[PDB]
Amino acid sequence: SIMDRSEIVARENPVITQRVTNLLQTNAPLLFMPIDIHEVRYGAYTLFMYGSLENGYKAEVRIENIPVFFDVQIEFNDTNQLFLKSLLTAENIVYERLETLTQRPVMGYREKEKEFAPYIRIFFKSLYERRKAITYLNNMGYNTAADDTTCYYRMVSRELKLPLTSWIQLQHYSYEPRGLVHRFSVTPEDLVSYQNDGPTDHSIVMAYDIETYSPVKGTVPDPNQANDVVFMICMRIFWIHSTEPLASTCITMAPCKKSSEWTTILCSSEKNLLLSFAEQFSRWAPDICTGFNDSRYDWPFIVEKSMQHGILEEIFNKMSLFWHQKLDTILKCYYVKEKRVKISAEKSIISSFLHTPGCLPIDVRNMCMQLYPKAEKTSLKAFLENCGLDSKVDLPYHLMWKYYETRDSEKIADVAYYCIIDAQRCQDLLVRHNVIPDRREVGILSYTSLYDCIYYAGGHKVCNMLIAYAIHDEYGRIACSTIARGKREHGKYPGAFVIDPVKGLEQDKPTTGLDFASLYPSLIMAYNFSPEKFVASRDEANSLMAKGESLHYVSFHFNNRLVEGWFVRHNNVPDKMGLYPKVLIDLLNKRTALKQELKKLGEKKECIHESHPGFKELQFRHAMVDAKQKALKIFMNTFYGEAGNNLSPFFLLPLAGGVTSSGQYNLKLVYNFVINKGYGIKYGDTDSLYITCPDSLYTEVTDAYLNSQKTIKHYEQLCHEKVLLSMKAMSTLCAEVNEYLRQDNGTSYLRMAYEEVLFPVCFTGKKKYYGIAHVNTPNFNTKELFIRGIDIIKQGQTKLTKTIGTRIMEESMKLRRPEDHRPPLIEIVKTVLKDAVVNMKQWNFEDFIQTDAWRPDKDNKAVQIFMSRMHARREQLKKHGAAASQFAEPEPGERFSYVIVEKQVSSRKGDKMEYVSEAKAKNLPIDILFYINNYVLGLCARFINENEEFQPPDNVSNKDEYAQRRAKSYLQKFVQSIH
DNA sequence: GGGGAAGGATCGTATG
DNA sequence: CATACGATCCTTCCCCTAC
């Protein structure tokens, strides 16, 4: 009584399935979407594309006769061809046939006459022979183009204009049915990409969750232990873009009540449990598998228990659409172990999953941390609360273990419900964050598969997109390589132009940030930074300068040596434009067009009410345009990172050095121009300059304030006029700066932008500033603060960090008369901290709660001391004949909530720990001083750790974490003094 | 890896 | 005036996630 994928799809959309089968009967062209891409390495190369048709059917399509090739840059001739033939034959490499052609080298500028270079293309039958031949030819010093060595489906995506994450049209195929999967065989000239907006996708995502058991109480279950078992396997199948359950199931050992919302299958053993899981997987055939933290606890434990019982081979072969495979191949090539997934520049994750062909695995946790690289709490509850979704049901783990042990068939239904809701929340997060469409659009722009957009970094994607744009081209097939060459020199680039910030509470004149709009791509656009326009020899550069060519000179100090170079300018002619400027200009034009389209779609969505039967497609188009513009942004902001990476094939030290030096030169020019115009400089950071208007421009506006009744409302009037005059003057300042830049570099791709006005403002140090933000009209009554640098977004251990950090900032940023004896930042911190300490009643009890875990095997000192004190108290109460029921020990692994209390005359954390129930029973003081000292002063020290008094002497090595110690000690002394 | 709690001697310094 | 306090350098898990 189990319903397979075909019947479910037929039940969902009958008319679409009828149209699909009518098209299939007549062998008409149809539509396909790939999700997981698998390729065979040995033997004849056939590329398998797994995915879904437009109704929801599972389709495998194999692309036969893909041309497998790579290019070598030698002079084409009979003698050279014979020599290369002998070289390939001597090291027993099987070749198919050879071709000759002409291509443009990517490194080094050449004139028009010598623009093309001869290349010989080697055709091959298998990928293994190609990899051996490419290694042999690279070891002999020959140059190699179209030289991908890791994955070859990127070659198929690049050469054929065939995105592997977008729709593909099947024409002239060969259908063959084998049940739940439909097999097509296609010739690569019979495949085309679907240009316009495709229909609604109908892929299937299976969200699964596992609940386990361990005889050793209070310890996380471990796969290696023999007694450790899985007992709940709960999984649901959803659409790619919906949260409604298509079909749900629970696979169990312990008896459970029949439920009308999901199907429960009873298994008498763990082996039968795993086989039932595999059978339901095979019957449903997910396009995508998912689950929260499934690559670190779920899949390893499943595969370890499958290996222990010796059923891994049969489970894999039932769950995979590929042919039969043996256990060694499954453990070697398909079960990945210790794979590294990158979040940011300093964070990496270890993941392990079973990549069965026909289904692509995604961790919800990996996407959640990729979208929020600075997230501090990475639990499911934390992400659910941040994203504003329904939280998990309150079921403790020890209660689950106890109810499993009692074998009570009635209430294991609650355990199943908890596991199914945990499965639901994963795809709830996936739909709410719109991860899969964003990855699809990244793949469309990058010509990669979805697997690469999920588990690989974006730098390789940018490199792939650049190669894809280069190889097609409009002016003659620019050829480029992929593997890196030359010595990977390591060093530090020259430092940025440091501008000393004028620290303090600036509330006499407004400041405003002039920002370079996409500075590094703009300099790449303007100065024609491309590898094929680079000249290294000085004599060649002089010869080009002789024949009426415009060049840009770059010179920088790297590793104590002078690196110099010349770049050929395009002179505002698209024919002479380089590869990087062409790619960036195309991406910027696309971004502008989609910005216009998104504005029109948003206006239409605001116009059209939700009751009309057209809101779904409008929201769906809005989702596509938002995803597309986000992908365009993430590729455009990554060009400099890929250009500066040493491992990149396109890496060129003059290119990165010239980009940095040109940014330096333009920032210096803007700085000098602004100073010579009379304006002031407050802060400068790479691409941003904060400008303060001259005093004289305000004079008349100030004069009416001095001759008035001199009241408060007069001062808000003064501030209002101040902001208006600042905006009006500095818009013209920005226009003149743009005109000067255009007159300097000769192009119009480098412009400045007027982001918002900051008044009053506070710069506390390097990359640490805040203030009131004004966008078009002044509003000083707002509670929204423009913040950068200060880590106010930190829940930490208490909510007092939030409250006091906000209160300091708000007390600093209000308007004050020039006759109210303006206190500096340190005095404001002093008075707000005194107000916090003295006025105890302003706080509530719930902000003083902390949570901890009681694990009687770990050497957690404070928890050990608290539990020892509680045990001593319980023994003392029992000796006195007192029923210490609410003093009882927690169950092992059970989280408990505590507070800190005053202890009259140790100072350790443990002796002040008390239970929440005990604290509310006795109404004890909550010892605000300890909380303030250990949690609030960390943030409060960030505000005054650049003052003159808190400075190191000259004879000290460490300069960063050496003044905050004195700041914290000074605040400690002040807090202890105020009593 | 980055922050949280806990443990020890001696110089730096002070006082009845 | 020689003891007693105290803070800094430095060292060791523990929490983090999933049960």
Q: Residue ranges per domain, chain A?
A: 1-201, 204-433, 659-797+805-819, 846-977
**CA–CA dist A738, A743 (Å, integer):** 9
Closest C-alpha among A694, A945, A696, A955 to residue A829: A945
What token pair was written down for A428? 């709830």
Does residue A352 contact residue A337 with C-beta atoms inside 8 Å? yes
Location of structure tokens 């199914």: A420
State, as a whole number of angstroms, the distance between the CA of A973 and the C1' of C1: 29
CA of residue A429 relative to chain centroid, distance: 15
Secondary structure tally for chain A: helices H, strands E: 31, 32
Answer for the pair A162, A156: CB distance below 8 angstroms, yes or no. yes
Cα distances from A791 to residues A19, A373, A459, in angstroms, run 56, 14, 28
Relative to beta strand A204-213, strand A288-291 is parallel
Q: Supply the CATH classification number for the domain A659-797+805-819.
A: 3.90.1600
Q: Dihedral through CA A597, CA A603, CA A605, CA A611, nearest 10?
A: -150
CA A938 / C1′ B3 distance in Å: 12
Residues 6+ apart with CB under 8 A from A974: A830, A833
Q: Token match 């002093």: residue?
A: A830
Alpha-carbon span A568 to A535, nearest angstrom = 8
Burial of A849 (0-12, 13-18, 19+ CB in 10 A): middle
HSE toward the beta carbon, residue A48, CA cutoff 13 A: 20
Q: 3-class DSSP state for residue A360? A: strand
Name every residue whose Cβ is closer than 8 Å to that of residue A86 and which is 6 or more positions away in sequence. none
CA distance A753 to A734: 7
- The amino acid sitting at A224 is N
CA angle centred on A672, ends A668 and A675, rounded to 5°: 140
Q: Which residue is nearest to nucleotide C14 (CA to C1')?
A: A860
Task: Measuring from the CA of residue A380 to each C1' atom, give the nucleotide at the shortest distance.
Answer: C17
Classify domain A846-977 at the CATH topology level. Answer: Topoisomerase I; Chain A, domain 4 (1.10.132)
Q: What is the DSSP letter of A374?
A: T
Q: What secondary structure does DSSP assign to A442-462, as a single string? A: HHHHHT--HHHHHHS-HHHHH
Q: Return the number of other C-beta atoms located less than 10 Å from residue A659's C-beta.
A: 23
For the CA of A974 and the C1' of B16, the distance in angstroms is 28
Q: Which of A712, A936, A939, A950 is closest to A835 using CA atoms?
A: A936
What tokens were used for A385?
A: 């609360």
Nucleotide nearest to A377 (CA to C1'): C16
Resolution for the entry shown, Å: 3.2
**Which residues have CB under 8 Å from A654's CB, separation 6+?**
A534, A536, A554, A563, A564, A565
Nucleotide C13 C1' to residue A334 CA (A): 37
Q: Which nucleotide is nearest to A794 (CA to C1')?
A: B3
CA atoms within 13 A on the CB side of A226: 1
CA atoms within 13 A on the CB side of A303: 22
Cα–Cα distance measured from residue A424 to residue A956, given in angstroms and rounded to the nearest whole number: 56
Identity of the residue numbered A286: P
Tell me which of 3.40.50.2300, 3.30.420.10, 3.30.830.10, 3.40.50.261 is the CATH number of domain A204-433. Answer: 3.30.420.10
- Strand A752-765, strand A768-774: pairing: antiparallel
Distance (Å, rounded) from C-alpha A857 to C-alpha A266?
Answer: 35
Structure tokens at A547: 């024949």
Q: How many residues does chain A have?
A: 979
Ramachandran region, residue A893 (left: φ > 0; alpha: ψ -120 to 50; beta: rest):
left
Would you give the distance in Å from CA A425 to the centre of its chain?
A: 20
Q: What CA–CA distance (Å, rounded) separates A576 from A590?
A: 21
| Closest of A497, A374, A504, A375 to residue A770, by C-alpha | A504
Q: Which residues contact A327 (CB under 8 A, 6 or more apart)?
A: A312, A313
> How far from A228 is each of A155, A312, A477, CA to CA, in Å?
46, 18, 60
Distance, in Å, from the CA atom of A717 to the CA atom of A664, rounded to the nearest integer, reads 40
Strand (E) or helix (H) holding A41: none
CB A788 within 8 A of CB A770: yes
How many alpha carbons lie under 13 Å from residue A781 in its C-beta half-sphere? 1
Chain C positions with any atom < 7 A from a protein CB: 7-9, 13-19
User: How long is the CA A667 to C1' B15 vector, in angstroms?
Assistant: 61
DSSP, collapsed to helix, strand or coil, labels residue A548 as coil
A193, A168 contact by CB (below 8 A): yes
Kind and range of the H or E run holding A607? helix A579-607
The Cα–Cα gap between A209 and A418 comes to 10
CA dihedral A940, A942, A946, A949 (to 10 degrees): 30
Terminal Cα distance for chain A, rounded: 75
The C1' atom of B3 and the CA atom of A424 lie apart, in whole Å, by 33
Specify the DSSP class assigned to residue A334.
I
Mark A267-278 as b/e (b = at least 16 C-beta within 10 Å): beebbebbbbbb
How were these coordinates obtained? cryo-EM
- Residues A138/A131, Cβ–Cβ less than 8 Å: no
Find the Å distance, CA of residue A864 to C1' of nucleotide B4.
15
Residues with CB under 7 A from strand C: A 209-212, 218, 220-221, 292-293, 296-297, 376-382, 397-398, 401, 419, 422, 853, 855, 858-861, 863, 893, 962, 965-966, 969
Q: A481 φ, ψ to 5°?
A: -105, 180
Structure tokens given for A746: 């000769």
Broken C–N links (> 2.5 Å) in chain A, after residues: 905
**In the structure, how far is the CA atom of residue A773 from the C1' atom of nucleotide B12, in angstroms?**
48
Backbone angle region of A245, left / alpha / beta, with phi > 0 → left and psi within -120 to 50 → alpha = beta
Give me the residue label for tokens 């994450």. A165
At residue A680, what is the residue type?
Answer: G
DSSP A746-761: S-SS--EEEEEEEEEE
The continuous run of DSSP H or E covering A421 comes out as: helix A412-433
**Closest by alpha carbon to A579, among A660, A664, A476?**
A476
How many Å apart are A966 CA and C10 C1'? 19
Interstrand relation of A58-63 and A181-186 (parallel, antiparallel or unpaired): parallel
Q: Which residue is nearest to nucleotide C18 (CA to C1')?
A: A297
Q: Yes or no: say if A758 and A771 are a contact pair by the CB < 8 Å rule.
A: yes
Chain B nucleotides close to protein (CB under 7 A) are 1-2, 4-7
